[PDB]
Structures are given as C-alpha cells and as structure tokens.
Amino acid sequence: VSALERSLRLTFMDELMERARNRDPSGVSEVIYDMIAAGLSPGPRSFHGLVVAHALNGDEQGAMHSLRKELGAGQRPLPETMIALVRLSGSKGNAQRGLELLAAMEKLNYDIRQAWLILVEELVRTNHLEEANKVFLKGARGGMRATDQLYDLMIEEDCKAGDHSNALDISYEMEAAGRFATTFHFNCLLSVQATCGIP
Amino acid sequence: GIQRRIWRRRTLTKKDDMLPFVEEQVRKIKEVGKVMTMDIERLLLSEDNRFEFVNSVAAEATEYVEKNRDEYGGTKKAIFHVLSNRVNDLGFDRPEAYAESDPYKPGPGYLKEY
Amino acid sequence: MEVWALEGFGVAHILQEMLTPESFRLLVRELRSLALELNHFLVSEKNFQINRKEV
C-alpha cells in the first residue's frame, strides 16, 4: 500500500461512513462505485457501511442484498456486520432469517453467542415472544449459556403471558448451564401454577 | 536473591524415616475382572450421588447402541465400554470395554473349562 | 421380601422388569364389578392438562 492509496482510501471511507451514519444507502452505493472507478477495491468495512445504512432505515431486503454484494465480491463480512443483520432481523420478527445468519457466522468461524443474545432480546422487545422462545431454546439446548439478565427476562415474560411450559423449559436449561433458580424465578412459575385449579 | 545466574537448590536437609512374587495374583486379578471393580469405585469418588451415576452410565450406554448396533452384545459390552471410556477420560489407560482373550486356546471349537 | 430387598438397593428399573400392566388392568375390572371406578390421571407439569390413562 502506497501513501497515495492510503490518502484516497481515507477520504473515500470518510465520505462512505458519513452517509451510512446519515442513513443514506443510496449515497453509500455511489461512493462504492466511485471507489471502483478509482480502482480501489471495496473491503469488508466498505460493505459494512452499506449494510448499516440499509439496516438503520429498517430495510431488510436491501441489507440482505448488500450482504450478497459483499459475498459476491469475495470479501469476508465483519462480525459486527453480521450482528447488524441479525439485530435487524429480530426487529422485524424474522426469526428464520435471524437463524440463517447465525448459521453463517458459525460457518465463518465467528462467535455466535453474543449475536444469539442480541437476536432473542430483539424478538422479546418487538412482541415476538413466541419466536423468541424458539430461538432461545435452540441456542440453550445447543450448549450456549445466556446472560443472567436474559434468563430473568425470558422466565418473567413467559409467566406474564401464561406460558408456563416455556418458562419451565428455560428454567431447567438455566440450571443445567450452571445458574441455579432463586426465589424470583420460582415466584414467576407460581404466578401461573396458582391459577390452574390444582393446588 | 538474584546472584550471577547461581541459585540455592532446595533439598530435604532433614530425615524422613518413611522414605515380588505377585505375578500369578496380578494375572488372576485381571482374569476375574477385579480391575473394573476398582475403576468403578474410583469413578464413584468423583460422584455426589451413586444413583445418578448409574442413570448417566445407562444413558450413555443407550447412545452407544443406537450409534453402532452391531458392535455390542458379544465380546464388547456397551456398559463396559462406557466405564472404560470414563476411566480414560480421567487420563488413565484401560483396554477398550475391558475385553481380553485367552492366547493359549488350541484353535477353534475349544472352550476353556472351569 | 424380594421386592423389599430390591427397593433397599434402589434398583428401580430392575424391579420394574421383574414385575412386568395386566396385574393392574385386571384389578380395575374386578373393582368395576363392585360399582367402583379407579381412574389414573396424569397432570402435566408444563401446561397443567389432565390426561386419563387408558386402563
């Protein structure tokens, strides 16, 4: 890498990242074609700005298309790039796409624990509790250990919705991981058991 | 402390008073299967409850039979394979499923008589 | 006494093999002859739904 190439990449990546943060996926596409005209090869961080720009404007199809451009260019997506797509999929309730992206990160040899934690919280936040339980249990049964904050989140939200079957499954997996249930978790299960008519 | 490097080797510098015909017995112990008896007691020293140890061994033995059906039931028993694997997991060495055979058998058709 | 010895060892699956159900299904019919019904219900610990076992 010469000094002239480094100088151009700085001003090209300055313009590109100032439009990704501006939530302008169209502008981020123009700069990439400016890089191609100059002969500069867009790296993983240039397509990251394209994914983020689409992701910030709630655009799941364009962000997935941007990922295909990155893969089609032979570049390796950053771990943060996949997390932006995983978090976007959860916000739209697309658990199937969120799980497909997690499989890609495992294929890319990344660490999917943090991205799996993000996917479950997005589904819970966006009132997709049924989808969140499916994703959470698959990760928990797969061997991943969730955060204590997320364990308390999943148990409590299921019991507020009257879903004792999922809340009991999670609490069993929580102890199998090595986190013992406390009075808080039992009080969540009892909130549903007390209404079943069988004392 | 640091001297150049030359250093003082630590030695006992104090007196500790605490510092051959079993071949037939040793070979008979292996023949009767007493080695696995000591291994079972060794494994149970690492177990809090012996009833969950029995269940876990049976659960692991069931997985072996589903995975490879035809290799078990004769000279290799699944439960013996589980116990030998768990001893090897501790870092010690045991033959697979504790299976041993008589090398002095005078050919096919001959059964050793007790 | 053999059942007691097996229970003392805690060999629950050995005891189940040596007992096996026809012994209990036949008991239900004889109780039915006295105008008594003996129903076996399983309550699910997950969703609290009651299942009547086929006896």
């Binding site: 990922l67 499989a103 890609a104 | 009833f51 | 805690g10 629950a12």
Partner: peptide, 17 residues
C-alpha cells in the same frame, strides 16, 4: 434410588472469479 426425581447463505454467493 435410580427412580428418584424422574431418574443456507454463503452458498451460491461466492466470487465469480
């Protein structure tokens, strides 16, 4: 005893080269 206590992305998206 032993009865106590119940006993594909990244595919078809490669570089054309």
């Amino acid at each position: 005893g032993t009865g106590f206590n119940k006993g594909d992305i990244l595919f078809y998206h490669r570089e054309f080269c």
